[PDB]
């Protein structure tokens, strides 16, 4: 044979290219140095292809794989096929069952390193040294729809990272919102089946705007802090790499002495905080349900790694009781006002995995992995998740050797008496299978806890109490985070929250429901209670109106780190520009648009009317991405139209659309010279306004303005503009 | 702790040391040194212990083993017990489904040669070369029994041999016989039911001495020819290394030239062939359950490596129907008198696994694991077995990835478009999933047939008639292979297969299946059924006696290859003999008999009425390896009492019994000195018997007499003076 | 064809006969007329078989049973023939995993009723009135062999009861010896690795005589005490029908008051303790290893029902 | 099997038969029918071969194929008429 292309275009080049100039790859093809401790222990299972024989399993050469075996040519397939029925039952088994919650969910391999040795807090061995680098896995999720469901739904986003260190796995198994929506794993499964599809017809996918799930809410107002995080833009991001982390939960950090310290994990996006907007979203889950693993993969190809800050939040074991909430609460947030974020380190996530299946969707991360240095708490959601991974795993990974799968498995030493089970890859060659046995002379041996390469011991904490299936009075407060959350978002982010509830109640059925919803929300606050009732044609009631709204948080009438936009945190980098082209360009734009784009790393698609390419006025040949309905505004941050022949395309329906879509997702655009016609289909006016761009030619200063637009993300002072823009 | 005994007696020598001398141990730590190619590439999972400390799954290290986490020393064990939930959830999970059928399995690793390039009828790449060796994995195995069933039952036994080969695995999944019981793969289930423990109450275990068994067979005629197999002592081998192995059904060998000649597989044990009596054999199964497992694992850590030629039976395609029988009839044999078996090469198994589950328990053996230079025949058993085998083990072995479990995987090249499935361990990086693609050039290849290195490509046999459910004329003639192997055994072979007969259907309860039976063996040959009726308490009618027995085979009326015994081929090296001790034995006679066992690689047991040491006449330390009732007669292959304080054990009833017990199972006695006086116990005459080795000492020619004895096995001219005997 | 002999012999009577004299049965066929409301429940899926068809698990009937589909007689067989795969499919996915320990074990149904009310001590319903039968099924079984080994090895026995009890299901998971050998659940592993066969070469089956064994006792002096009741005549005994049985544990019971009271459960054998002798036992193993799957069978089939206080 | 956890997938409710199924098929895993046939196979005389047989006929016939006309090589070939 020989069907690749003469001139060697089927293969990408092994380089950092920006998204859409080459055709994405496994890692390893795409960057075969990009290198860490977990990439070169993968090599022995790694399989290539090039120049070898097409062969069965059992490395039969096949002659003809085109065929069944079969008596004449067109007679009846014989069973003694062999060929064909490896290969057809191989076909046939490649499902695994999808994971319970999470099951949507795109990860690439980093690497994580400290910025200075935490040894005075905690003995964990990955944090010890700033010199020391630790591998890491990390898959970002949805939470309710299945494996094949789309990126850019309303939920919660799961945050898994799996650090691969010298004494242990230790996996931070973190969401994008601060707490969880119930305080007791035993309610899970509940909380769960009132969220994913109804069980009569499995319906909807991906979406909390149902019956069941608002159901539960109204009468579960432990929910309503993370109800707020996932009604509020933070339930659509832009980016996995501009969404923040948390652990969620307290947990324990111990140092060689023994002192236990109460911490709270942290992420912070170093491209910053950045999240879509509702239409945009939604419009996005049809146009391209894979968006976020996209983005994931192609800003990793490009070399806009998505970097991350590990950060602390510690508290003093003394201070446990000092705060009008239980630390052991998984519905409240620790204010970062009260108890400031330390920085610890950074993960980058370099490489893309080689072949999905066998790398993300066999994965395995569980909280109850920790090592040597942390311990948990017994906060009653964390304590249920310690039994659920261990279990869901060994059905949904087909065994108890799931840490023998390529990803999971640990890179520092493992030695234990356990056996067999399905699928057992390691062979041991110990004598003994027991202990205490002196036939080995008792190895692998214990090891007694220590300051450094000890075995685990827990911390010592006092339990006094009886057996009770009870929840902690002190638990019992569900308004004011909330509340704190609320006061503490911009007007258009509360409008956004607003709208959010407003249109997730439209969808329930049973108004009792989101009458019951309403009355939640007049114990938060009254104003956000009230806009959303309008929306419903629902009235207040006297006494709703008259619910004395609930305490500060220890003093806090608003933080504003719990919004995304209060402070000022843009990044560039990364992000993608539409270029609206014409028939006859003009060629001074481009050169200009590109070279400024290029210099904040801002990426570029050039779109037209149909493929192939057009020619700018100086002969220059510009080749076209795509179409305007191939690539929508949606998956672009800003659109910038230049000058030339605008007639080409002012007549395009799509062009304008491409233009009144981008306006009303509140998106910078940019219009050079008779770009400035365009100005009638989003009806601004002569003298201009805040967020558009307008000039004779494309210059310098031109795109200094777009660029300044694209680090504050969106023109949220063209909300009450957008109403009267039929889009 | 540091528990192993400080002179290192814990640790058995890496060095060959027979059978008993020192612990047994995995195979890699008891002969590091016997390496081969699929032996080397297991490295990468073989685990390691010494030295190491223990840790979790995960690779964190355990400081205390011994104790759960609880709140208080005597409180409740806290969910929070991640150490403890692992372990104990890997232990819950080490069970797989058994086979179901050839449950009970021993198995060990060997090498191959062929003695001479067999190019000339097949391009095969393993027999093309006498230079090129190919690892083998064996697995040697009962039929009906579970995985913790006994080895010595009356039952087939299996024979599976993994070829490791350059151009794919080669499984030959043979028998101990020649046929099988049943024609055609449907009715498999039937056969296998039946056979099988009883649905109701699952009775019995490892026996086919039931109704249902004898119940189908009476039914299905086409069963006898295996069912005389199964009741002579071929049912019940002495080891797995002195039965013969056969293949069964008729295969191709397909050349260069594309010639196919039919060929039957054969294995002859180079140790000869050799089997236990009944009560032996039954007894057996209660003191040594694990009797084959042991003796092979022990003959292979004292170098007595079980070694077997490969032969094949060719018959050109010309000669496909000249033969009374059909050559694709699985329940008939090709008499070595008409088809001589041609030497092809030798199989030695020379180092036991590591760990049995991982490598016996996982082993996964299929017919259809053909290679170019191979191919398959019509036999409609064979066809059936083709769809099998893969199908059971995508739930046996958790998934369609089984060929990743590390000994079954190939030590060739292993590429194709494959991927996913339940325990996925190889990533691939190919850009394709498919073929025919050009994205990556179409790599994986396909590759023609040709004479080495080439694809497989199936052998264009013609194929004429009509979609039929229909056995095959040529099949229907059940009685005249019974009858052939019936009188091509010795008298006592007859003897001994008309008890097995005899004692199976005493075990039937309903009385019409054994008359049932009785009529089937009237078909077959008179005396064989007078003999087994007159058992039974039945008498044949008129008609019976008038059976025209069957017409001889191609003119053959016997064949005595078809034999254990009729051509002596008895071999004493790995063989053993129990010597009772005394305590004042003859130094001398010690001397002259151990050293003379030894230079014929003949393995002894010292044994005495409690374990410790015994001193010998002249000071010697002699170290008892058991006592009487702990290594019964059954165990060994012959006896020898020296002289010495014979009152010492004279009146000890475990003593005198061990020799009832071994002559009654015919095998050698010797009895030196004072010894003699043991003869009233077995009731020899003074003037002594043919099988009784006795002499004043055991100096001159006592030792080779008892080794003559022993070569020829056991002494069957004592068949009528164990009639009485009350043992 | 092959049908049955015109007397009828070969169908067991159904009533109740000695050891024997009849070939044993399936439970429902055996006794009829035995019921209780487990027993009935099960209704729903007994399949009965004679005058029906034999048929696919589709329901399609199957004109020949003998024979796979080929081309021409001496034929290939085509990979069309649904019926041959089907009934080699299930055929080849007959085996589930056994039980990681009690693999061998041999039951049967039963009822319980207690001699008075408990309620003094206890608000459990199945103890709360002397009327009030509660249907068991019963589970005895080795420790440590497969599901295939011996039952008459010397070894503890499992002796497992299910209540189905009108506010739940109780099951009463005891052994023959009041003890155990270890202390805590987090050397179970270990302990079952230690008497389980050893792992190089998976030998021996349903025996603790090997070194692994006595190494961890050895090393482990809490495993003493149910030792010495292994290596006693306890550790091989006669029947089922002829044993202790323990739950080992003190549990607790709770009153409606809420006073509770630490228990320990027996099982007492209204037919005595009987066990054999270590020659005589060992032997069996060989002779028949399903000696007490066939006792426990037979004596059910004889109306010498096992009785346990 | 792999997708539904065993071979006694149509005792699952919805793929249940509604006409009878009787035969000769054990075990497996979540087996739910518990069939009290004295016999797992056939032939047999301890169930006087009971389920049985049907042969082909116009109605309530055990299946049989089409004695369809096989005539060929052993090939792995495409049809010329599929070309
Ligand atoms: C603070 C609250 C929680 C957080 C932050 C959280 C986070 C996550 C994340 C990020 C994943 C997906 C990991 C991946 O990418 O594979 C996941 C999966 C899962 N979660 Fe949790 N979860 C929480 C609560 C719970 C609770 C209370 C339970 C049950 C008691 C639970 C059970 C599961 C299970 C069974 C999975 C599937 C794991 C697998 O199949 O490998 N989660 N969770
Ligand atoms: C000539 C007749 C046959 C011979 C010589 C034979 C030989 C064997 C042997 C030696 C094994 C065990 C391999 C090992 O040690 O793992 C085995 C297993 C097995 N046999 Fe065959 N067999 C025969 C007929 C059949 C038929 C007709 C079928 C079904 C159509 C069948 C289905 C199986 C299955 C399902 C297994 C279990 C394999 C596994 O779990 O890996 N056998 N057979
Ligand atoms: C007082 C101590 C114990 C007693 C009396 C006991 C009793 C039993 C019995 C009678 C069975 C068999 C039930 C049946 O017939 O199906 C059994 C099975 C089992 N035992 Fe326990 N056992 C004990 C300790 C333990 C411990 C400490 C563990 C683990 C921490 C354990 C794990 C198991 C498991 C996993 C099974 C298999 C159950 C199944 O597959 O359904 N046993 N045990």
Redesign the interface.
């Known amino acids: ?5 003469e001139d060697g275009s ?2 990408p080049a092994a380089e950092p290219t920006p998204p859409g100039a080459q ?1 994405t ?2 890692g ?2 795409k960057a075969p140095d990009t290198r860490n401790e977990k990439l070169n222990s ?1 090599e ?40 064909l ?3 057809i ?8 069952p999808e994971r319970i919650v999470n099951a949507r969910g795109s990860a690439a391999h980093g690497y994580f390193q400290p910025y200075k040795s935490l040894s005075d807090i905690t003995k964990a061995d990955f944090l010890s040294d700033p010199n020391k680098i630790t591998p890491v896995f990390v898959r970002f999720s949805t939470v309710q729809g299945g494996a094949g469901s789309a990126d850019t739904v309303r939920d919660i986003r799961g945050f898994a990272t799996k650090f691969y ?1 010298e ?3 230790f996996d931070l198994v973190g969401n994008n919102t601060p707490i969880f929506f119930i305080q007791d794993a035993h309610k899970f499964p509940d909380f769960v089946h009132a969220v994913k599809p109804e069980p009569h017809w499995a319906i909807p996918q991906g979406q909390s705007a149902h019956d069941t799930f608002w159901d539960y809410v109204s009468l579960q107002p432990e929910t309503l802090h993370n109800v707020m995080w996932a009604m509020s833009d933070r339930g659509i991001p832009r980016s996995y790499r501009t969404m923040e982390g948390f652990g969620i939960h307290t947990f324990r950090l111990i140092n060689a002495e023994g002192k236990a310290t109460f911490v709270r994990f942290h992420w912070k996006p170093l491209a910053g905080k950045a999240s879509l907007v509702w239409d945009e979203a939604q419009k996005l889950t049809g146009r391209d349900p894979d968006f976020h693993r996209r983005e994931l993969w192609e800003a990793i190809e490009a070399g806009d790694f998505p970097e991350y800050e590990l950060g602390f939040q510690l508290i003093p074991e003394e201070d446990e009781f000092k705060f009008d909430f239980d630390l052991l609460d998984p519905t409240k947030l620790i204010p970062e006002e009260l108890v400031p974020v330390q920085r610890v380190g950074k993960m980058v996530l370099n490489r893309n995995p ?2 999905f ?3 993300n ?2 994965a395995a991360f569980h909280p ?5 240095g942390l311990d ?1 708490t017994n906060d009653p959601l964390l ?2 998740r ?2 659920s991974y ?2 869901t795993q ?1 059905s949904r ?5 799931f ?1 023998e ?2 990803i999971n498995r ?1 890179t ?38 220590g300051p450094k ?6 911390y010592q904490e006092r ?1 006094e109490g009886n ?1 009770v299936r009870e929840r902690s009075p002190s638990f019992g407060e569900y308004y004011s985070h909330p509340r704190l959350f609320w006061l503490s978002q911009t007007p258009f982010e509360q409008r956004h929250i607003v709208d959010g509830f407003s249109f997730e109640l439209s969808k329930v059925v049973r108004p009792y429901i989101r009458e019951r919803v309403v009355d939640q929300l007049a114990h938060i606050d009254l104003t956000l209670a009230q806009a959303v009732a309008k929306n419903l044609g629902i009235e207040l009631t006297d006494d709703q109106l008259n619910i004395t709204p609930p305490p500060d948080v220890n003093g806090l009438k608003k933080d504003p780190s719990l919004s995304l936009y209060a402070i000022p945190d843009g990044d560039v980098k990364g992000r993608v520009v539409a270029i609206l082209l014409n028939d006859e360009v003009r060629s001074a734009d481009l050169l200009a648009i590109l070279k400024a784009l290029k210099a904040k790393g801002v990426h570029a698609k050039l779109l037209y009317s149909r493929m192939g390419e057009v020619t700018a006025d100086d002969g220059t040949v510009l080749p076209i991405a795509a179409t305007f309905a191939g690539a929508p505004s949606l998956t672009v941050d800003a659109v910038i139209v230049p000058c030339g022949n605008i007639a080409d395309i002012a007549d395009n329906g799509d062009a304008n659309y491409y233009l009144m879509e981008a306006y009303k997702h509140l998106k910078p655009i940019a219009l050079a010279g008779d770009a400035r016609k365009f100005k009638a289909t989003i009806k601004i006016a002569d003298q201009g306004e805040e967020g558009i761009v307008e000039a004779d030619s494309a210059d310098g200063s031109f795109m200094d303005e777009l660029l300044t637009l694209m680090a504050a993300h969106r023109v949220w002072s063209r909300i009450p503009k957008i109403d009267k823009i039929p889009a």
């Open positions: 044979d020989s069907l690749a292309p089927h293969r055709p790859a496994p390893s093809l993968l022995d299972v790694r399989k290539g292809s090039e120049n070898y024989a097409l062969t069965t399993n059992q490395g039969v050469r096949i002659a003809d794989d085109q065929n069944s075996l079969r008596a004449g040519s067109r007679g009846p397939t014989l069973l003694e096929d062999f060929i029925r490896e290969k039952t191989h076909f046939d088994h490649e499902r695994i260190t004494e242990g796995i080689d072949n299946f066998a790398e969707e066999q109850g992995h920790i090592v040597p948990f304590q249920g310690l039994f261990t279990d060994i990974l087909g065994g108890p050797n840490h799968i390529p640990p520092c030493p493992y030695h234990n008496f356990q056996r067999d089970g399905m699928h057992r890859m390691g062979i041991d060659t110990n004598p003994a299978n027991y202990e205490p046995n002196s036939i080995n002379d008792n190895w692998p041996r214990e090891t007694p806890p390469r000890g075995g685990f011991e827990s339990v057996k």
